[PDB]
Amino acid sequence: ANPLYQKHIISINDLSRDDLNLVLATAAKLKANPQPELLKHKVIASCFFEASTRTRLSFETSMHRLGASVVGFSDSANTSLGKKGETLADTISVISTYVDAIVMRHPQEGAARLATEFSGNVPVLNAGDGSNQHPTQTLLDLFTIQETQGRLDNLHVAMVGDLKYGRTVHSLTQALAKFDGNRFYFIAPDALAMPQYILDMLDEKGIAWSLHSSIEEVMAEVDILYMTRVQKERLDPSEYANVKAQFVLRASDLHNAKANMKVLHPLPRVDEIATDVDKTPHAWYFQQAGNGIFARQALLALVLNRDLVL
Amino acid sequence: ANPLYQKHIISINDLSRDDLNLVLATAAKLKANPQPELLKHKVIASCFFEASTRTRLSFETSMHRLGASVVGFSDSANTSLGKKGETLADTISVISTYVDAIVMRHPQEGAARLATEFSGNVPVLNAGDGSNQHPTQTLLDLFTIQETQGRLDNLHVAMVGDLKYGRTVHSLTQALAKFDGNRFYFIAPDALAMPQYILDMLDEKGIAWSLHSSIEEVMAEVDILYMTRVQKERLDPSEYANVKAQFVLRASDLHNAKANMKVLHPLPRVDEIATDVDKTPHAWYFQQAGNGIFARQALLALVLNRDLVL
Amino acid sequence: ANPLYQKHIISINDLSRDDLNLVLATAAKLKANPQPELLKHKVIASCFFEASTRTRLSFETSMHRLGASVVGFSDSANTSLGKKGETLADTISVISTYVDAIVMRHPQEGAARLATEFSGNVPVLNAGDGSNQHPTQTLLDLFTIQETQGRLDNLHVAMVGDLKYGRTVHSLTQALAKFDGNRFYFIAPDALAMPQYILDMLDEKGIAWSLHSSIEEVMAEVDILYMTRVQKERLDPSEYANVKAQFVLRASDLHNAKANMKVLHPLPRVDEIATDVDKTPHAWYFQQAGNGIFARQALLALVLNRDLVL
Amino acid sequence: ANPLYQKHIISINDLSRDDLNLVLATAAKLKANPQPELLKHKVIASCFFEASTRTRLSFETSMHRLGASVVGFSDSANTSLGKKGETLADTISVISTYVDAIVMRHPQEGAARLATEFSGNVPVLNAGDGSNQHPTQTLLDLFTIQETQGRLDNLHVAMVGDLKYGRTVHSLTQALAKFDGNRFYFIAPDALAMPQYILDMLDEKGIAWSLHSSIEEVMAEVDILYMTRVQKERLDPSEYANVKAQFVLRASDLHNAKANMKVLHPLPRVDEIATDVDKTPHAWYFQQAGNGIFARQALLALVLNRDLVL
Amino acid sequence: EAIKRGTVIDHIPAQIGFKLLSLFKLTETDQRITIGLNLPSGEMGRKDLIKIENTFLSEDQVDQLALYAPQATVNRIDNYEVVGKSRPSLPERIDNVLVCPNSNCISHAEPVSSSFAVRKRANDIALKCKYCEKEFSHNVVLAN
Amino acid sequence: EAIKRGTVIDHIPAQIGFKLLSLFKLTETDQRITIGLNLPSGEMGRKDLIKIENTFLSEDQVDQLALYAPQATVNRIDNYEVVGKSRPSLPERIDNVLVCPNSNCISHAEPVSSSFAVRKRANDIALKCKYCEKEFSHNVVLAN
Ligand SMILES: Nc1ccn([C@@H]2O[C@H](COP(=O)(O)OP(=O)(O)OP(=O)(O)O)[C@@H](O)[C@H]2O)c(=O)n1
Ligand SMILES: Nc1ccn([C@@H]2O[C@H](COP(=O)(O)OP(=O)(O)OP(=O)(O)O)[C@@H](O)[C@H]2O)c(=O)n1
Ligand SMILES: [Zn+2]
Ligand SMILES: [Zn+2]
């Protein structure tokens, strides 16, 4: 069978370069040639112990595009648990007797990993666990980069915004670090800098990174400009007002951008990207979201189907 | 057609021994040989006027395993009713024009029975009505007993916990009383004793039952140890602390248990069953939950399909 | 100083019969001759961590009737001290630097007793701690019994309703058992019987008590009919309907009542005393409530004023 | 009249060192000789648009200790003035026709200052406006420092915890910087450092300050150890765990402390001062809270009573 | 393995020795401690034994052993000599070590030491919590 | 005093011997155990020492002591003869005994054993939780 058959998908740290390439190649194939009956007769649990409409719609759409059936719930004040007192262990012990795969998002770190210890032979796919992992966001980000740039090595990647608390940027940085010759530009308020542990990991592998106070310093060289949301809460309202101009993007900022350059953003954007960017050929955040469908399909297909029939 | 074709499933009191055997035989067949297209083109309403994630996931999974489509809702503060003022009668009058079957759970006793008076030719399946009935829990319990024990007659069944307010144990006791030679052991706090009306029903049929203050008195003889949840609310916190040791199960308690003995629990368990029981060959509560899928499939199949094609 | 000067008032079990009589004698004096300036320049904290409008109004009115000033709070859902983040210990350590006495009601048993360990020289009066004590309710009940019957010894006292969970009936029984020759009648559904430990205490003191299934069995010999609320949760709706007639009182039930007999109820009485009782000479529950003012004035006066009240 | 008669008390930056000393001297006088009728016949509004039980109790107790009457409100979730529909302007325009002074706490910065523009001749006392000012906290802190150390000049003051977002530590630093020869030690996680603008102010005045990674580096020379709460939100749970040991105090940390040293904390202290500190002679946070009464009495007396207090 | 000076708690039932060390924090000291667990007795079969040098226990400290090692002997040793022999007796109060089984008791969340009044009954021991004033069998309190 | 057969854990730092007994459930056996706490060491000033008869520790079990008694020595004994001396080395992994400092880690509320990957750094040991994947200094995880 394929290397990912019946495997849990919990952390980008568990996925090798070959694994990432395989998911991405499978995504390209399903995108070119859909297989709407591949997972016919499979039932998949969509378990959002923590609610996330955006992620859940995308995942469930992926499930239906392969012909799978879906059961599930979305929590915080409505579900018959997470207020009650049944262990997550017991919840998984039950659910894994029902379904062929469990996709789960949860407010505590480690939750998906714990699930694997109770799911028997049912694969668990992590749709996000606290501030830990969200590997399918990383997969869709990587698929988008590879598709627009034609490669995952020798790139200039700028990351802008809240680099301290972005689960999404940490994961993407680790992922890209599995490839060669990539160079990083970190553009963030000092209060929200990329964490040292990420920087140590980059140093250890001889991967170049530098800090910059404005997008302008790197625009001419950037292949991927990855914007993140700055939660107003994570700063004081005055503090925000003083530094926000250095993490906010408008169409005028793109004048000297390379032709290949794409602007990505995991969404939602509110302030970070002006609507005038939307019409430029560089805006690729909506196409990125759309690619979540193919990345998530590829993952379900690889996990639930022995042989790449594609 | 089969005896259950187009029949409402409202109460264990409405089901004869033959009916129970038929559901259970059908469950065994679908478990051995799935029929994922049996209910193709059927649409089933999953109507949880009272929320119950556990029951709802299980029921909907059953629906999808037969190829049916599902529409529905789960209530208390979100649905556009049960806060408004439309009669349940009108709600059913509408919904029964949409779907091929209605599965419903509701906070008032009698709700499913009332539904049948307004659903025209659309079958209603009761997923629980207040403290009255929950016949598909009873069906899955019975299927689990029959499968592990090879029979439903001449059993020694212990029931432990909150026997006064357990809708689940009352129903299971009535069901087993439709069979011969069964003997019951009731192990409960005095405040939470099995109700007299149940005891009168057992007396009337010459069925043996006895009270015991500890599991140890009956362990050597028990075929089925059916544990129930004791809601902390239904006792005062001190009261609970004083009697809880006599409704709590741990692996050491099973030393002299027969080889065939199974421990069941409708779930959730929190205190009642120590996690160390889980690894013994006697723990069967998760397998029991898993059997809900086959019991619920059998019921949908029998109700919506004239002839047993199996 | 008087025996209660600067003493905490936490539990009826900590108060002697002499203490009880002293509170009652002081209550009669203040009732007969108000002292509106006795506690002039005292500041009292009215701390209702658990809300209780009727008890708080009663207590605060008593404070004003003696001329004290009042600061306080009441928690419906939210305050971040005494519960949420801060320890009750810390809350008391702070509040006992502001005020001259603390009146507190709290959802956990032992709360007021814990307060005394952090209040320094500031007295604490227990306005109710979970299912433990409510000494000023018992004090106002005793005052009302003494006033209408002329004594607290050699009485026939009937207690009706939820005798199991009524903290109020438990303490009234303990209190009355400090006096001589009292005889008790306990009318309660079997699910809600007077706890054994209360029965054991009466037995040890050679105090007569009997159980009765209905009010009429004893109506002809009682001096005090003390009714309590049976909250619907403590039973199942059908169970409630089945038994309720035993613990509900209407005017016709009073036909053979002694002339001196008074009906008491700590309130609210919505579900157990019919309004047709209100106009009989036996109805004394509103007079009882009115006596809360005098009992609570007496306690405040005794605890905060060195000299005995004249 | 005294210099503060009929003045608004909004910001520490509007108060001179002479004003500060005047408040403190008046606080010492009232502490030593109460004047329970000074503000007889005054009516004070206690307007807690933002709830704050501890601050409100403190303020209201102070009002009663001077004999004033009190009317007010506190907003947990709902009032349709000062926020919801009506402008704060209109609310103040109305309330300033009822009362003799307004004490207000509000979630938005500038709220009290805005109140002064609509209060006519009615004085406004700021009980806290968002992340801006909290002058009576600072006044009670200074009183406590002056009392225990005998002076407010030439002190060694350590501030620990969330120095970035603590409005209380910012104003205490400004206040202490109005006096001569004070030296500051700032112990805080790098994410929560004392803001530059405070540092700039100290530099301009030639006031010495240094940064320290832990309490022990300076324990031997501090006269005042002022601790603050680090609320968990301001950091990520793992980040919190990683650094917290630097800003938590236990009794063993005090081995080499000066005899005169006092530990202060504006409270609640649940997460940063161990309870074993409480019994040491250095623990002064509850005494500090008790001093809130005297500082707030002094301010009310000075603002509402023409003549200086004797 | 004899000691010149201190206390020797002898005749502790097996599986209680370590429990005593834990509950009463006996190893939180700089004094020399010597311990034997699962020692042969014949005096009772198997036993535990605890020796604490330069350390002595008040009568009430010895009484706190009652619930766990009712048949123990506490020996006082000075100049290598056994000067005192004592047996635990049921105390009137037990503080610090017990936990109140009432989950709504204020004692759980708070900076206070647990405290129970001890009442010997015919078949067991009744423990009454200082805070919630609920009374429980010692069997129930000791369970957790 | 000498034993015939089993394991002797020597040169345990003071105030660690009791830790070892608790964390590693050493007293949960019927085998004879002799323990010496706060013993004089010419090499350490003071030390702790544990003897467990008829019981033997595997290499990983010995390595599980590394965090607490890095300079301990474990003696395998048979016929009054030391037949093997070993010393704790840092293991790749530490299970069961540690608690994750992350309050939001799923490990806390749940029927699972804690698990940490071990990684030595210049001046401390990094411990990465299997569940939340956060890494902490050992000084933080060990923190009381
Ligand atoms: N210098 C000493 C003296 C005695 N012991 C111990 O103290 C306990 C009691 O000593 P002793 O009364 O001499 O022995 P017994 O007479 O057997 O006491 P008992 O009858 O109580 O068993 C024994 O465990 C002994 O080893 C000791 O450790 N150090
Ligand atoms: N039959 C035996 C043999 C040895 N020991 C113990 O095993 C440990 C080590 O034995 P040994 O190598 O003989 O002593 P040392 O030379 O001091 O060992 P090291 O150099 O490691 O300290 C000692 O604490 C000793 O008391 C024991 O209890 N029983
Ligand atoms: Zn208690
Ligand atoms: Zn963790």
PDB file of N, CA and C in Angstrom, chain A residues 14 28 76 78 83 95 101 155 186-187 198 202 236 260 268 300 302:
ATOM      1  N   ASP A  14       5.656  14.743  12.139  1.00  0.00           N
ATOM      2  CA  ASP A  14       5.650  13.312  11.845  1.00  0.00           C
ATOM      3  C   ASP A  14       5.745  13.032  10.344  1.00  0.00           C
ATOM      4  N   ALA A  28      -2.692  17.215  -6.799  1.00  0.00           N
ATOM      5  CA  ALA A  28      -2.659  17.690  -8.169  1.00  0.00           C
ATOM      6  C   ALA A  28      -3.464  16.763  -9.081  1.00  0.00           C
ATOM      7  N   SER A  76     -18.986  23.610  21.852  1.00  0.00           N
ATOM      8  CA  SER A  76     -19.131  24.817  22.681  1.00  0.00           C
ATOM      9  C   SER A  76     -20.596  25.239  22.886  1.00  0.00           C
ATOM     10  N   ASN A  78     -23.492  23.342  22.777  1.00  0.00           N
ATOM     11  CA  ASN A  78     -24.579  22.577  22.155  1.00  0.00           C
ATOM     12  C   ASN A  78     -24.439  21.044  22.213  1.00  0.00           C
ATOM     13  N   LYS A  83     -18.835  19.500  28.551  1.00  0.00           N
ATOM     14  CA  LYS A  83     -19.547  20.286  29.549  1.00  0.00           C
ATOM     15  C   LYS A  83     -19.909  19.271  30.615  1.00  0.00           C
ATOM     16  N   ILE A  95     -16.797   6.445  19.258  1.00  0.00           N
ATOM     17  CA  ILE A  95     -16.899   6.889  17.874  1.00  0.00           C
ATOM     18  C   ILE A  95     -16.127   6.001  16.905  1.00  0.00           C
ATOM     19  N   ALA A 101     -13.073   6.795   9.659  1.00  0.00           N
ATOM     20  CA  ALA A 101     -12.029   7.795   9.909  1.00  0.00           C
ATOM     21  C   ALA A 101     -12.589   8.886  10.795  1.00  0.00           C
ATOM     22  N   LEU A 155      13.291  28.911  -2.269  1.00  0.00           N
ATOM     23  CA  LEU A 155      12.297  29.978  -2.267  1.00  0.00           C
ATOM     24  C   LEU A 155      12.690  31.092  -1.307  1.00  0.00           C
ATOM     25  N   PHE A 186      11.265  37.559   8.252  1.00  0.00           N
ATOM     26  CA  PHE A 186      10.273  37.692   9.312  1.00  0.00           C
ATOM     27  C   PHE A 186       9.979  39.173   9.590  1.00  0.00           C
ATOM     28  N   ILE A 187       8.720  39.548   9.422  1.00  0.00           N
ATOM     29  CA  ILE A 187       8.283  40.938   9.551  1.00  0.00           C
ATOM     30  C   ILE A 187       7.156  40.987  10.569  1.00  0.00           C
ATOM     31  N   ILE A 198      11.943  28.213  16.939  1.00  0.00           N
ATOM     32  CA  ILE A 198      11.860  28.113  15.481  1.00  0.00           C
ATOM     33  C   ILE A 198      13.179  28.573  14.878  1.00  0.00           C
ATOM     34  N   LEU A 202      16.059  26.581  12.593  1.00  0.00           N
ATOM     35  CA  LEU A 202      16.537  27.051  11.291  1.00  0.00           C
ATOM     36  C   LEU A 202      18.060  27.137  11.310  1.00  0.00           C
ATOM     37  N   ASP A 236      -2.407  45.697  23.114  1.00  0.00           N
ATOM     38  CA  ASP A 236      -3.265  46.718  23.702  1.00  0.00           C
ATOM     39  C   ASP A 236      -3.655  47.678  22.576  1.00  0.00           C
ATOM     40  N   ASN A 260       6.062  36.225 -10.470  1.00  0.00           N
ATOM     41  CA  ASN A 260       5.667  34.953  -9.875  1.00  0.00           C
ATOM     42  C   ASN A 260       5.114  35.073  -8.453  1.00  0.00           C
ATOM     43  N   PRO A 268      -9.354  34.325   8.548  1.00  0.00           N
ATOM     44  CA  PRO A 268      -9.836  35.551   7.900  1.00  0.00           C
ATOM     45  C   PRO A 268      -8.815  36.677   7.931  1.00  0.00           C
ATOM     46  N   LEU A 300      -7.427  12.245   2.682  1.00  0.00           N
ATOM     47  CA  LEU A 300      -8.435  11.213   2.947  1.00  0.00           C
ATOM     48  C   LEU A 300      -8.227  10.001   2.022  1.00  0.00           C
ATOM     49  N   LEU A 302      -5.458   8.988   0.499  1.00  0.00           N
ATOM     50  CA  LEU A 302      -4.220   8.252   0.776  1.00  0.00           C
ATOM     51  C   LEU A 302      -4.382   7.415   2.034  1.00  0.00           C
TER      52      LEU A 302
END
